């Protein structure tokens, strides 16, 4: 039943797989100190670069100290092996009710009251990160890493450390759904405003129930459109003018012209 544990006995791994990605497999686990189930994520160490492995360790140490209602709890991390696999284990608060991505798939639309409340919570989570000293920039905010505490619960932003694997400047294979990112992030030249861009694109997806830029077949075509100011076609499908305006001011090409988080939280839309 237990197929691993942390060196101090505090966390146990079950052989119950609950997510997967290029770099990770996620298992259900247990905090024996509290009795609460946790997520036990195994990062494939051999795929990482030296600088990524260094970064992950530094970021995991700052992560352990963070606490905010709209950020997924990060408990700890260490190096582990099992048979021929070395990994970095990360233990986080278990999220059982899906993500914004799963919500949209299942329920088809997000009603505006829900959009308003959950977007407000995402902005509080980001304001919290950006006001840490020094600021934490998420860098990889998306619908699939904004977790819900229940189908009518609150949202919590997750994967803050995993964002250090975003590999924004890498060549990548043309397979699966091509992705966009903020124009400056292609060159790795970010600040807080990259999270505003990403927030805007998340809101657009919430408002339209589609991933932006589906008209493009690959990430190069997306790159050409994003770095020349061309909006995703789904922008024109946002039915509510107020919601469309907010998106528009978040997803500006030039980072210095985007909304600030303060100005979003102060916007009429958000009380």
From Swiss-Prot:
Changing residue 50 to M: No effect on kinase activity. It comes from the Eukaryota. Changing residue 159 to A: Loss of kinase activity. ATP binds at residues 22, 92-95, 142. Transmembrane segments: none annotated. Autophosphorylated at Ser-169 and Ser-173, promoting its activity. Autophosphorylation at Ser-173 is inhibited by intracellular calcium. Residues 12-270 form the Protein kinase domain. Chloride binds at residues 74, 90, 160, 162. The modification Phosphoserine is found at residues 169, 173. The active site is at 159 (proton acceptor). Changing residue 47 to M: No effect on kinase activity. Changing residue 41 to K: Reduced kinase activity. Loss of kinase activity. Changing residue 162 to F: Decreased inhibition by Cl(-) ions. It is found in: Cytoplasm; Nucleus; Cytoplasm, Cytoskeleton, Spindle. The RFXV motifs mediate recognition with downstream kinases OXSR1/OSR1 and STK39/SPAK. Disordered regions undergo liquid-liquid phase separation (LLPS) for the formation of a cytoplasmic membraneless compartment that concentrates WNK1 with its substrates, OXSR1/OSR1 and STK39/SPAK. Serine/threonine-protein kinase component of the WNK1-SPAK/OSR1 kinase cascade, which acts as a key regulator of blood pressure and regulatory volume increase by promoting ion influx. WNK1 mediates regulatory volume increase in response to hyperosmotic stress by acting as a molecular crowding sensor, which senses cell shrinkage and mediates formation of a membraneless compartment by undergoing liquid-liquid phase separation. Belongs to the protein kinase superfamily. Ser/Thr protein kinase family. WNK subfamily. Interacts with WNK3. Interacts with WNK4; inhibiting the activity of WNK4. Interacts with SGK1; promoting its activation. Associates with the mTORC2 complex. Interacts with UVRAG. Interacts (via amphipathic alpha-helix region) with EMC2; promoting the ER membrane protein complex assembly. This is Serine/threonine-protein kinase WNK1. It comes from Rattus norvegicus (Rat).
């Amino acid at each position: 039943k237990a197929v691993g544990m942390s060196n101090d006995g505090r966390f146990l791994k079950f052989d119950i797989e609950i997510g997967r990605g290029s770099f990770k497999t996620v298992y259900k686990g247990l905090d024996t100190e509290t009795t609460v189930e946790v997520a036990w994520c195994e990062l494939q160490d051999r795929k990482l670069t030296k600088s990524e492995r260094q970064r992950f360790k530094e970021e995991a140490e700052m992560l352990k100290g963070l606490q905010h209602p709209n950020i997924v709890r990060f408990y700890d991390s260490w190096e582990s092996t099992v048979k021929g696999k070395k990994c970095i284990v990360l233990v986080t608060e278990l999220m059982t009710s899906g993500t914004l991505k799963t919500y949209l798939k299942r329920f088809k639309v997000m009603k505006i009251k829900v959009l308003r409340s959950w977007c407000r919570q995402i902005l509080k989570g980001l304001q919290f990160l950006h006001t840490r000293t020094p600021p934490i920039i998420h860098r990889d905010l998306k619908c699939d890493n904004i977790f819900i505490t229940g189908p009518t619960g609150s949202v919590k932003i997750g994967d803050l450390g995993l964002a250090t694997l975003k590999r924004a400047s890498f060549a990548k294979s043309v397979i699966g759904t091509p992705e966009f990112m903020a124009p400056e992030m292609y060159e790795e030249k970010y600040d807080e405003s990259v999270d505003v861009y990403a927030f805007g694109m998340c809101m657009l997806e919430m408002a339209t129930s589609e991933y932006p830029y589906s008209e493009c077949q690959n990430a190069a075509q997306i790159y050409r459109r994003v770095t020349s100011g061309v909006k995703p076609a789904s922008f024109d499908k946002v039915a509510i003018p107020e919601v469309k305006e907010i998106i528009e001011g978040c997803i500006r090409q030039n980072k210095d012209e985007r909304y600030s988080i303060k100005d979003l939280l102060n916007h009429a839309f958000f009380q």
